[PDB]
Amino acid sequence: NIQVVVRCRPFNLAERKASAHSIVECDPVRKEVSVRTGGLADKSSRKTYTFDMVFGASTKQIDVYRSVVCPILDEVIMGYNCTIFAYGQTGTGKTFTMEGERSPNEEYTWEEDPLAGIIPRTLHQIFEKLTDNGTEFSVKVSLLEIYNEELFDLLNPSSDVSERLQMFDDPRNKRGVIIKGLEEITVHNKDEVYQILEKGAAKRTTAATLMNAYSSRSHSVFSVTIHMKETTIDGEELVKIGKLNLVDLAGSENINQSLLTLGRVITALVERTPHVPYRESKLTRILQDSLGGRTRTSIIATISPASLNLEETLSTLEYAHRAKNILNKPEVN
Numbered sequence: 495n496i497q498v499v500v501r502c503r504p505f506n507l508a509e510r511k512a513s514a515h516s517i518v519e520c521d522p523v524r525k526e527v528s529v530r531t532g533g534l535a536d537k538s539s540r541k542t543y544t545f546d547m548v549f550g551a552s553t554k555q556i557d558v559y560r561s562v563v564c565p566i567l568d569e570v571i572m573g574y575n576c577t578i579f580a581y582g583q584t585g586t587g588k589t590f591t592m593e594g595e596r597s598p599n600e601e602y603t604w605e606e607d608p609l610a611g612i613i614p615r616t617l618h619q620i621f622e623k624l625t626d627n628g629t630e631f632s633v634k635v636s637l638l639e640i641y642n643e644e645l646f647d648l649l650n651p652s653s654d655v656s657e658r659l660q661m662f663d664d665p666r667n668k669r670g671v672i673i674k675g676l677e678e679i680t681v682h683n684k685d686e687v688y689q690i691l692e693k694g695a696a697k698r699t700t701a702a703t704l705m706n707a708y709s710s711r712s713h714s715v716f717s718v719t720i721h722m723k724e725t726t727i728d729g730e731e732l733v734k735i736g737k738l739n740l741v742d743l744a745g746s747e748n749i750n751q752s753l754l755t756l757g758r759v760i761t762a763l764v765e766r767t768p769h770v771p772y773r774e775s776k777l778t779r780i781l782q783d784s785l786g787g788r789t790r791t792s793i794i795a796t797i798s799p800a801s802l803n804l805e806e807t808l809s810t811l812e813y814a815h816r817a818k819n820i821l822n823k824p825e826v827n
């Protein structure tokens with residue numbers, strides 16, 4: 495049973511300039527989201543949905559991390575494979591939540607930036623939790639992006655972001671794949687983190703100037719792999735592996751093969767259709783095990799609070815709510 499949560503961003507300055515009204519109410523306690531749907535015609539009308547967790551407009555980055563990620567990171571350290579992906583309309587906060595942003599000027603260090611998202615906070619915790627705990631461990635990260643069914647490597651040594659990756663079925667996993675050419679960087683300590691992310695963002699910036707509407711049409715896949723040593727009571731040394739995939743999806747409002755097959759894959763699972771079209775898109779092949787497989791999965795549905803985005807917001811809520819019916823069978827590696 496996959497976890498689905500909703501995060502509503504606060505109004506932006508443009509919306510206030512236009513006197514935007516709010517049509518969203520979040521109730522963390524009852525874990526519900528209620529939408530005002532009749533504007534001027536019917537003031538009482540509304541659509542209420544129930545999710546595993548709800549975060550209102552005032553929710554801060556650190557709140558999302560403590561509530562959603564902490565539990566997931568524990569599962570990863572326990573030797574599980576987990577996936578968190580953001581789904582939502584362009585401009586609602588997918589990237590802001592998954593990666594976050596850097597505060598202007600010095601002001602804050604990357605480890606203390608209030609605006610930092612899930613990726614930076616997670617990599618920081620991995621080193622903090624595992625170091626102040628003993629345990630021999632090694633951390634490896636990768637960041638690829640899908641655009642028009644083509645795969646680009648943001649952490650690759652080559653200076654040209656357009657050099658393409660390839661995908662193949664993983665011989666040792668019926669529902670897993672191998673990314674040929676992918677650069678998996680070993681992160682020796684937290685002091686090596688920021689440089690890797692900074693290089694990553696730089697190559698992404700170059701890619702957005704190379705392809706049309708890159709930022710909103712692409713899918714971003716960040717993966718973290720942890721190898722940890724365990725010694726049984728008998729003195730046997732073995733290695734448990736934990737893996738975390740942090741995915742920032744293309745805008746739902748929508749080169750659309752992956753987003754399209756994703757919806758198709760979800761529908762097939764909730765309706766129990768015989769054949770699930772995983773093979774039909776680069777995205778669903780990478781996430782196959784996350785959708786009905788052995789990976790612990792959580793979805794963060796992002797929405798705007800404005801009356802103007804009513805239709806899309808309802809669409810996002812409806813889509814994410816169906817997703818609650820997808821069942822997975824988590825299994826340690």
Ligand SMILES: Nc1ncnc2c1ncn2[C@@H]1O[C@H](COP(=O)(O)OP(=O)(O)O)[C@@H](O)[C@H]1O
Binds near residue numbers: 503587589
């Ligand atoms: N919780 C939030 N608090 C403040 N601003 C937010 C929040 N969520 C999103 N934003 C704003 O929305 C904009 C980014 O949205 P964005 O990350 O591009 O959404 P997405 O990646 O789905 O398009 C940013 O300019 C940021 O200021």
Ligand SMILES: N[C@@H](CSC(c1ccccc1)(c1ccccc1)c1ccccc1)C(=O)O
Binds near residue numbers: 590610614692694
């Ligand atoms: N959201 C920003 C990146 S924020 C990011 C980052 C986070 C994850 C992966 C790569 C970069 C960053 C921004 C600018 C320079 C370096 C890194 C970031 C933000 C806050 C703390 C750590 C990393 C973007 O879309 O460009």
Ligand SMILES: [Mg+2]
Binds near residue numbers: 588589
């Ligand atoms: Mg984005």
